[PDB]
C-alpha cells in the first residue's frame, strides 16, 4: 500500500502531472527549474514542513511560472 | 494559612518606589528601611503594575464569578465595557453639535459614576430586643456601601424576568440607566433612604 | 493624520503606502463586500462610520503579482497563510477591492467552512442522486453574488439549455441573471443554480469575455472533513456535497484569463489543532496536491510601523478612551500584551 | 454485559402525534407497502391515502388516528432496521405511550400485525363510543412547586357537584415529567381549573385536542369490548423488555398482559415512572441510545424534561421525508 510505503515518488505523481500541464499550456500560450521544484516538493511531502521549506517551494514555483 | 505572621502583604504600586529620597519624610524613610527586614508574601495572581489596572472593575468581576470561572467573568466584563462604549459612540454620532459636548464615551467613567450613584449612605441593622424584631438606622461605612452598590447591580442583572437577554447587554443597559440616575437600582437606594427615614425614632435603640 | 493615505484607489498603492489606512466608500462597501468583511470588522465600520484598511506588504505583493499576470497562461493559484488573526482575510479583501475596480468578475466565497457544518436542510440532488444539496447556503451566496456583479448578469449569456423542471427551463442565449434569479426565487434549484454559474464563468473567461477572480476564504475546508451526517448517523465526505464538489473544479488551473486567490483559516476549521497554520497542516495531503503548484504568501504580525499606525488610527477615531492609552507606557503595554498581533490588539482596544 | 451506550431503547408515540404527511419517507423503504396493504385488508379503508393526503380533521378523529400511529410506528421500525441493523439488534427496552404500547409488543414479538390492528381498531371504536356517551376532555397543566394537584381536583369535583351530576370525574390521567400532568374529566371541571389556575398555582394550561377523557373510569364501557378482542389473541413472551403503563415496570409473564392492557384503558399513564425505570442510574454511568420510532418528537421533549443526560443521546426517526431515495 502506498500509505504504508515510506516515500513520495515525484515520478508519475500529481505534482508531476500538474506541472507538466501548466508548462504545456504556457508553451501553447507562447530542466534545472524542474529539478529544483521537485526537490522542494519532495522535501515538503516527506520531511517536516517549516517556513524555510515553504519559501523554497515558493521560489521554485515562481521561477517555473515566470512570476517575479 | 501557609504564611507565617511575619509575612507582610506586598505593595504593587510602581510609582511609590520611584519617589525620590528627598521627598520621603522621616516616618516614610523609617517604614521603607523597615520593609527590608520584613518577609513579603508572593504577589497574587490578579493585581499588576499595569497602567490599565482598575481595582473596582476587578472586584466587580470577582463578584460576578461562579465556581472560580474567572475567564468567563472577565469575558463578561470586557463585553459589557465594549457594549457601553459602542452605545455611547452610536449616541454621539447621532447627536447635534451642542449635544456632543455632554456625552461621555469612556466606559470606565460611566462604570465608576454609575456605581457611585447607587451607593446608600444609611442602612439598617436587624435587632430584636423586646421580643419583637426592630430595624434601626445606622451610618454605613464606605466599604459597606461600595459593596452594596455592586451587589444590587449584580442581583438586578441576574433577575429571571430577563428571559434570554445575555448578561453583557443587561449590565450595559443597567449601567447606562444608573449613570443618569435612573433604573431599579437607584429606586432601591431611594426605597432604603426613605424606609430608614420612616424609622428615625428607632435610632435611639443603637 | 499620519495613519491615513489620501490615495483611495487600490491600483496605485505601493511600498511607500505601507502602514497607511485607505478609505473604502460606502458604495464600494455595499457593492464589493456584501459578505466579505470579517464579522468584527463590520462592527468597527459601523462604530467609526468608515471602513479604512491598512496597506500591508502581503497585499502589496499579491497586487504586484496580479498586475503582471499573463491572461493567456493558466490561472495561478495564490494562497495567503499565517498565524491566527494576522490579517489574511483583510488582505484578501484588499485584493478583491482592487480587482472589482478594474471590472473583473468577482467570485467571492466569504467562508467555505460554513458549507461543511451545521446544515439542517440537506437534500438529495435530482441531477445526481449520489450528491447532496444545501439550498440555504447556496441561495444566501447567490443573492450577494448577484449584488456584486449586477452589471455583468445581462452581458453574460448562457451557452446551453438548462432544465430546472419539465415545466421550466432556461434557453440558450438567455442572460446569466435569469439563472441566478431561478436560484434566488426557488431554493429547490439553488444548488443546481450555483454550479451552472461556475460552469459558465470558468468557461467564458477562457474565451476572453471577462477576467475572473476566484476569491475563496478558508480554502482548507474543501479537502478536509465535515460534521454533516446522513439519516443513518454516518459521516458525509466533502466531495459528496454538490456545492463543494463544484467549487473544487474552480481551483484547478485548467482555465485562463484570471487568477485564483485564497486564504487559509483555522478559525472554524474542523478537526484541526489551534496552532496549525502552515499550508499542509491545514490543507492535508489531498488539499496540497490539489493546489500544487501554487504561490504561498505569508501574513505576519504588525511590524513597529504598522503597529504604531494602527494605534494612531484608533486614537484619531477617539476609540482609546483610557487616559493612559495615548501615553508611551500604554503603547508598550499594548505591544507586549498583543505582541503586535492585529486581532489581539483590536480586541484589547475594544474595551479600553 | 453490554456497556451502556451501545444498546438502544425504542419509544413508540401515542395519541396526539398524528400529522398530515406521516408515512411519506417510509413508503419506499422495504416491506412497508405490505404492512399498509394488510392494514387495508383488516380495517376496510385506505390508511395510506388518509395519512399521506388528509384533511387533518378525519385524521384527528379517534377511530382513525390510533391505527395510523400504530402502522406509522411499525413502518419507522422497518426504516430504522434498514438504516441501522445493529441498533435493532442491540435493543434492551421498549415502551409505548397509550396506543404505542400495542406497537411495542408487536415489535417485541408478543403479538402479530393483524392481531394488533384488530385490537387497536376495536379499542379506538369503543373509546369513541364512550367519549360520545358523556361529554369530557383532558387538560395539560404545568405547575410550579407551590401547586397541589389532588387539591385542585377536589375543588374541580366540588364545583361540578354543586352544579349537579352523578359522581363528577376529575383526576390526574398522565404523569409526564416533573410538575407537568394531564388531568381528565368533565369539561366543566377543567374549565374551573382553567379559570382558577392562579389560585391553584398552575403556570400553564392547554386543552388537548382530544375527543374525550382518556385514562379515566369514564372509559369503563370500552373495557369489555377490548377484552373480548384480546381474548382470542395468544400473547407470547416479549423478546425485549417491554414496559407497561399501568404500573411502569417490565412485563413479567405473558398471562398478565391480557388484563394489564385492558386496565391501561381506565388507568393513568405512568410515563414518568417508566422513564425513571429505564434511565435512572448513578452519576457518571453512560446512557443507552434512544430512538423515537414514530411521528412527532413529543417523547423527545418529555425525555429532555425528565432526564437531560439520557436526552443527550436521543434521536428521532424521520417519518415525513427521507434523505436518500432507496
Ligand atoms: N489590513 C488590515 N487593516 C486593518 N485592520 C486589520 C488589517 N488586518 C487585520 N486587521 C485587524 O485584525 C482583525 C482580524 O483580522 P482578520 O479577520 O483579517 O484575520 P485573519 O488573519 O484572517 O484571521 P483568522 O484566522 O481569524 O481568520 C480585523 O478585524 C482588524 O481588526
Ligand atoms: N437543474 C439543472 N442543473 C444542472 C444542469 N446541468 C448542470 N447542472 C448543474 O450545474 C453543474 C455543472 O457542473 P458539471 O460540469 O456538469 O459537473 P458533473 O456533471 O457532475 O460532473 C452541475 O453540478 C449541476 O448540478 C441541468 O441541465 N439542469
Ligand atoms: Mg480569516
For chain D, the domains span: 1-133+211-326, 134-210
Resolution in units of Å: 2.5
Q: Which three cell numbers stand for residue D20?
A: 398530515
- Chain D residues inside the 8 Å CB shell of C129: 324-325
DSSP string, C1-65: -TTB-S---GGG--GGGTT-EEEE-HHHHHHH-SS-S-HHHHHHHHHHTSEEEE--HHHHHHHHH
d(C-alpha C269, C-alpha C271), whole Å: 7
Of ligand 2's atoms, which has the minimum distance to the CA of residue C245?
23
Integer Rg of chain A from CA:
13
DSSP B49: S
> d(Cα C150, Cα B119) in Å, to the nearest integer?
59
Cell 414514530 sits on residue? D294
Dist CA C48 CA C289 (whole Å): 43
Placement of cell 388531568 in the chain: D183
Burial of residue D289, with CB atoms counted within 10 A of its CB: 0-12 exposed, 13-18 middle, 19 or more buried = buried
Angle in degrees, CA C59, C65, C70, rounded to 5: 150
User: Which residue do the cell numbers 359522581 mark?
Assistant: D167
Strands B133-139 and C169-170, by their bridges, are: unpaired
Report the alpha-carbon distance of residue D89 to residue D91 in Å, rounded.
6
Task: Measure B170 CA to ligand 1 centroid, in angstroms.
Answer: 29
- In degrees rounded to 5, what are phi and psi of residue D314? -105, 145
Residue C279 contacts A where some CB pair is shorter than 8 Å: yes
C92 near C57, Cβ under 8 Å?
no
Q: Report DSSP state, residue B128.
A: E
Nearest alpha-carbon partner for C66 in C173, C205, C211: C211
Catalytic: D215?
yes
Q: For D149, how many CA atoms within 13 A lie in the half-sphere containing its CB? A: 21
Q: How far is CA B90 from the centre of its chain?
A: 26
Strand order in the sheet with D202-207: D202-207, D137-143, D180-185, D170-177, D269-270
Distance C140 CA to ligand 3 centre (A): 19
D143 by DSSP, 3-state: which? strand
Residue position matching grid coordinates 496536491: C289
**What is the CA C1 to chain-centroid distance, rounded?**
30
DSSP D152-193: HHHHHHHHHHHH--SS--EEEEEEEETTEEEEEE-HHHHHHH
- The three three-digit cell numbers of residue B128, written as one number: 430584636
Residue with cell 404500547: D101
Closest-CA distance of chain B to residue C350, Å: 6
Cell 459558465 found at: C200
Bridge partners (DSSP) listed for residue B40: B8
d(CA D314, CA B129): 60
Judging contacts by C-beta atoms under 8 Å, the chain D residues touching residue C232 are 83-84
Q: Cell digits for C257?
A: 484569463
Task: Tell whether ligand 1 has an atom less than 6 A from the beta carbon of residue C38.
Answer: yes
Size of chain D, expressed as the number of residues it contains: 326
All three cell numbers of D65: 388516528
In the numeric block, which cell numbers belong to residue B170? 443587561
Residue B122: asked if its preceding bond is cis (omega within 30°), the reply is no
C97 C-beta closer than 6 A to ligand 1: no
DSSP B101: G
Q: What angle do CA B130, B135, B138 make, to 5 degrees?
A: 120
- Per-residue buried b or exposed e for C115-127, using 16+ beta carbons within 10 Å of the residue's own CB: bbeebeebbbbee
- CB within 8 A of C224, min separation 6: which ones? C116, C238, C269, C270, C271, C272, C284, C287
Three-state secondary-structure class, residue D266: helix
Flag if C321 and B82 touch (Cβ within 8 Å). no
User: For chain D, where are the alpha helices, taking DSSP H only?
Assistant: 32-43, 47-52, 62-83, 85-89, 100-107, 113-133, 149-163, 187-195, 197-200, 223-232, 257-263, 271-279, 298-306, 308-312
Helix extents (H) in C292-319: 304-316
What residue has cell string 528627598?
Answer: B22
- Tell me how far apart the alpha carbons of residues D277 and D257 are, in angstroms, rounded to a whole number: 18
Interface test with B, best of C39, C42, C45, C47 (most B CBs within 10 A): C47
| Chain C CB contacts of A37 below 8 Å | 293
Place of cell 484588499: C94
Long-range contacts of A30-38 (CB under 8 A, 24+ apart): A33/A60, A33/A63, A33/A64, A34/A64, A36/A60, A36/A63, A37/A61, A37/A63, A37/A64, A37/C293, A38/A10
Q: What is the 3 state secondary structure string of D184-233?
A: EECHHHHHHHHHCHHHHCEEEEEECCCCCCCCCHHHHHHHHHHHHHHHHC
Beta bridge partners of B35: none
- The SS3 assignment for B126 reads strand
Question: Which residues from chain C sit within 8 angstroms of residue A58, using beta carbons?
Answer: 295-296
- Please count the other Cβ atoms lying within 10 Å of the Cβ belonging to residue B59: 13
Residue D250 is classified by DSSP as B
Interface contact B50, partner C, CB < 8 A: yes
* Cβ pair C289, C34 in contact under 8 A: no
Beta bridge partners of D291: D10, D315
Q: Is the peptide bond before C293 cis (omega within 30 degrees of 0)?
A: yes
Phi-psi region of D16 (alpha: psi -120 to 50; beta: other; left: phi over 0): left
Q: Does B89 touch chain C (CB under 8 A)?
A: yes
Contact between chains at A41 and C294 (C-beta distance less than 8 A): no
Q: CA-CA distance, C90 to C302, in Å (whole number)?
A: 14
Question: Three-state SS for C244?
Answer: helix
Q: In this complex, do B82 and C350 lie within 8 Å of one another by their Cβ atoms? A: yes
The dihedral formed by the CA atoms of C38, C42, C43 and C48, expressed in degrees to the nearest 10? 130
Would you state the cell numbers that stand for residue B43, as one nine-digit string? 504577589
- Find the largest Cα–Cα distance for chain B: 64
The continuous run of DSSP H or E covering B170 comes out as: helix B167-179
| C-alpha to C-alpha distance for C241 and D40, rounded to whole angstroms | 40
- Please give the grid coordinates belonging to residue C6: 489620501
CB atoms < 10 A from the CB of C69, how many? 17
Contact D7, D288 (CB under 8 A): yes
| Distance between CA atoms of residues C340 and C346, nearest Å | 10
Contact status, residue B59 vs residue B70, Cβ threshold 8 Å: no
- Any catalytic annotation for residue D82? no
Q: Nearest Cα to C312, choosing from C17, C8, C19?
A: C19
Looking at chain C, list the stretches that DSSP marks H as alpha helix, in order from N- to C-terminal side.
26-32, 39-48, 57-67, 88-101, 135-148, 152-155, 176-185, 190-207, 242-251, 279-291, 304-316, 328-338, 342-350
**Which residue of chain B has the CA closest to C336?**
B50
- What CA–CA distance (Å, rounded) separates D113 from D118? 9
Write down which chains contact chain B via at least 3 CB pairs under 8 A: C
* Dihedral class, residue D23 (left if φ above 0, else alpha if ψ from -120 to 50, else beta): left
Which grid coordinates are listed for C119?
A: 446544515
Task: Read off the C-alpha cell for D209.
Answer: 385536542
Residues near C189 by beta carbon (within 8 Å), at least 6 away in sequence:
C164, C165, C182, C183
Report residues whose beta carbon is within 6 angstroms of any ligand 2 atom.
C 127-128, 162-164, 189, 192, 195-196, 199, 242, 246
**Burial call A1-37: b when 16+ CB within 10 Å, e when fewer:** eeeeeeebebeebebbebbeebbebbeeeeeeebebb
Pairing of strands C258-263, C212-217: parallel
- What nine digits make up the cell of D246? 399501568
For C329, the closest chain B residue by CA position comes to B51
Amino acid at each position: 500500500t502506498e500509505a504504508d510505503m515510506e516515500e513520495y515518488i515525484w515520478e508519475n505523481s500529481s505534482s508531476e502531472r500538474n506541472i507538466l500541464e501548466t508548462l504545456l499550456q504556457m508553451k501553447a500560450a507562447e530542466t534545472k527549474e524542474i529539478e529544483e521544484y521537485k526537490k522542494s516538493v519532495v522535501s515538503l511531502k516527506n520531511e517536516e514542513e517549516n517556513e524555510n521549506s515553504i519559501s523554497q517551494y515558493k521560489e521554485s514555483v515562481k521561477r517555473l511560472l515566470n512570476v517575479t | 494559612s501557609r504564611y507565617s505572621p511575619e509575612f507582610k502583604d506586598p505593595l504593587i504600586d510602581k510609582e511609590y518606589y520611584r519617589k525620590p529620597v528627598e521627598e520621603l519624610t522621616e516616618e516614610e524613610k523609617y517604614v521603607r528601611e523597615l520593609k527590608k527586614t520584613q518577609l513579603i508574601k508572593a504577589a497574587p495572581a490578579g493585581k499588576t503594575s499595569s497602567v490599565f489596572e482598575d481595582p473596582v472593575i476587578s472586584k466587580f468581576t470577582n463578584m460576578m464569578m461562579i465556581g472560580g470561572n474567572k475567564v468567563l467573568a472577565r469575558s463578561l466584563m470586557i463585553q459589557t465595557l465594549e457594549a457601553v462604549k459602542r452605545k455611547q459612540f452610536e449616541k454621539y454620532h447621532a447627536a447635534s453639535a451642542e449635544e456632543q459636548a455632554t456625552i461621555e464615551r469612556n466606559p470606565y467613567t460611566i462604570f465608576h459614576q454609575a456605581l457611585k450613584n447607587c451607593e446608600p449612605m444609611i442602612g439598617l441593622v436587624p435587632i430584636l430586643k423586646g421580643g419583637r424584631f426592630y430595624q434601626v438606622p445606622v451610618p454605613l461605612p464606605d466599604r459597606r456601601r461600595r459593596f452594596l452598590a455592586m451587589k444590587w447591580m449584580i442581583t438586578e442583572c441576574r433577575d429571571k424576568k430577563h428571559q434570554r437577554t445575555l448578561m453583557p447587554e443587561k449590565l450595559s443597559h443597567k449601567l447606562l440607566e444608573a449613570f443618569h440616575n435612573q433604573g431599579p437600582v437607584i429606586k432601591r437606594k431611594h426605597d432604603l433612604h426613605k424606609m430608614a427615614e420612616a424609622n428615625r425614632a428607632l435610632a435611639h435603640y443603637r | 493624520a499620519i495613519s491615513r493615505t489620501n490615495e483611495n484607489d487600490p491600483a496605485k498603492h505601493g511600498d511607500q503606502h505601507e502602514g497607511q489606512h485607505y478609505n473604502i466608500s460606502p458604495q464600494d462597501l455595499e457593492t464589493v463586500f456584501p459578505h466579505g468583511l470579517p464579522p468584527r470588522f463590520v462592527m468597527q465600520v459601523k462604530t467609526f462610520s468608515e471602513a479604512c484598511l491598512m496597506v500591508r506588504k502581503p497585499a502589496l505583493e499579491l497586487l504586484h503579482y496580479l498586475k503582471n499576470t499573463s491572461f493567456a497562461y493558466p490561472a495561478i493559484r495564490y494562497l495567503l497563510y499565517g498565524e491566527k488573526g494576522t490579517g489574511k482575510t483583510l488582505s484578501l479583501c484588499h485584493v478583491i477591492h482592487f480587482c472589482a475596480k478594474q471590472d473583473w468578475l468577482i467570485l467571492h466565497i466569504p467562508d467555505a467552512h460554513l458549507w461543511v457544518k451545521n446544515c439542517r436542510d440537506l437534500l438529495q440532488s435530482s441531477y445526481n442522486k449520489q450528491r447532496f444539496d444545501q439550498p440555504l447556503e447556496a441561495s444566501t451566496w447567490l443573492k450577494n453574488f448577484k449584488t456584486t456583479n449586477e452589471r455583468f448578469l445581462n452581458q453574460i449569456k448562457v451557452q446551453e439549455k438548462y432544465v430546472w423542471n419539465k415545466r421550466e427551463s432556461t434557453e440558450k442565449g438567455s442572460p446569466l441573471g435569469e439563472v441566478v434569479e431561478q436560484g434566488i426565487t426557488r431554493v429547490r434549484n439553488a444548488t443546481d443554480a450555483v454550479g451552472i454559474v461556475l460552469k459558465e464563468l470558468k468557461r467564458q473567461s477562457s474565451l476572453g469575455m471577462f477576467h475572473l477572480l476566484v476569491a475563496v476564504d478558508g480554502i482548507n475546508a474543501l479537502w478536509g472533513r465535515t460534521t454533516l451526517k446522513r439519516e443513518d448517523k454516518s459521516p458525509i465526505a466533502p466531495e459528496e456535497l454538490a456545492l463543494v464538489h463544484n467549487l473544487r473544479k474552480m481551483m484547478k488551473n485548467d482555465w485562463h484569463g484570471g487568477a485564483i486567490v485564497s486564504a487559509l483559516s483555522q478559525t472554524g476549521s474542523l478537526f484541526k489543532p489551534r496552532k496549525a497554520y502552515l499550508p499542509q497542516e491545514l490543507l492535508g495531503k489531498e488539499g496540497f496536491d490539489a493546489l500544487d503548484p501554487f504561490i504561498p504568501i505569508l501574513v505576519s504580525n504588525y511590524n513597529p510601523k504598522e503597529f504604531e499606525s494602527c494605534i494612531q488610527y484608533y486614537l484619531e477615531n477617539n476609540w482609546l478612551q483610557h487616559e493612559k492609552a495615548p501615553t508611551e507606557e500604554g503603547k508598550k503595554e499594548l505591544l507586549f500584551l498583543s505582541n503586535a498581533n492585529p486581532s489581539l490588539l483590536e480586541r484589547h482596544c475594544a474595551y479600553l | 454485559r453490554r456497556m451502556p451506550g451501545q444498546c438502544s431503547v425504542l419509544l413508540f408515540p401515542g395519541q396526539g402525534s398524528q400529522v398530515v404527511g406521516m408515512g411519506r419517507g417510509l413508503l419506499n423503504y422495504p416491506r412497508v407497502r405490505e404492512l399498509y396493504a394488510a392494514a387495508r385488508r383488516v380495517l376496510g379503508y385506505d390508511l395510506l391515502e388518509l395519512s399521506l393526503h388528509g384533511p387533518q380533521e378525519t385524521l384527528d378523529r379517534t377511530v382513525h388516528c390510533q391505527p395510523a400511529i400504530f402502522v406509522a410506528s411499525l413502518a419507522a421500525v422497518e426504516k430504522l432496521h434498514h438504516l441501522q441493523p445493529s441498533v435493532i439488534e442491540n435493543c434492551v427496552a421498549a415502551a409505548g405511550f397509550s396506543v404505542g404500547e400495542f406497537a411495542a409488543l408487536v415489535f417485541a414479538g408478543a403479538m402479530e400485525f393483524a392481531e394488533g390492528l384488530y385490537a387497536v381498531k376495536i379499542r379506538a371504536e369503543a373509546m369513541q363510543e364512550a367519549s360520545e356517551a358523556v361529554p369530557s376532555g383532558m387538560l395539560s397543566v404545568l405547575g410550579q412547586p407551590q401547586s397541589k394537584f389532588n387539591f385542585a381536583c377536589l375543588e374541580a369535583r366540588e364545583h361540578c357537584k354543586s352544579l349537579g351530576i352523578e359522581n363528577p370525574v376529575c383526576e390526574v390521567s398522565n404523569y409526564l415529567f416533573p410538575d407537568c400532568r394531564v388531568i381528565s374529566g368533565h369539561q366543566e371541571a377543567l374549565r374551573f381549573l382553567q379559570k382558577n389556575s392562579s389560585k391553584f398555582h398552575f403556570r400553564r394550561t392547554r386543552m388537548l385536542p382530544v375527543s374525550g377523557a382518556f385514562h379515566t373510569r369514564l372509559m369503563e364501557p370500552a373495557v369489555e369490548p377490548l377484552t373480548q378482542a384480546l381474548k382470542a389473541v395468544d400473547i407470547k413472551k416479549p423478546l425485549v423488555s417491554v414496559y407497561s403503563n399501568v404500573h411502569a415496570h417490565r412485563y413479567r409473564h405473558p398471562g398478565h398482559i391480557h388484563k394489564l392492557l385492558a386496565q391501561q384503558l381506565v388507568s393513568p399513564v405512568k410515563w414518568e415512572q417508566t422513564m425513571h425505570a429505564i434511565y435512572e442510574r448513578k452519576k457518571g454511568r453512560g446512557f443507552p441510545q434512544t430512538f423515537e420510532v414514530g411521528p412527532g418528537r413529543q417523547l423527545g421533549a418529555i425525555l429532555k424534561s425528565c432526564n437531560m443526560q439520557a436526552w443527550k443521546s436521543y434521536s428521532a426517526v424521520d417519518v415525513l421525508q427521507t434523505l436518500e431515495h432507496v
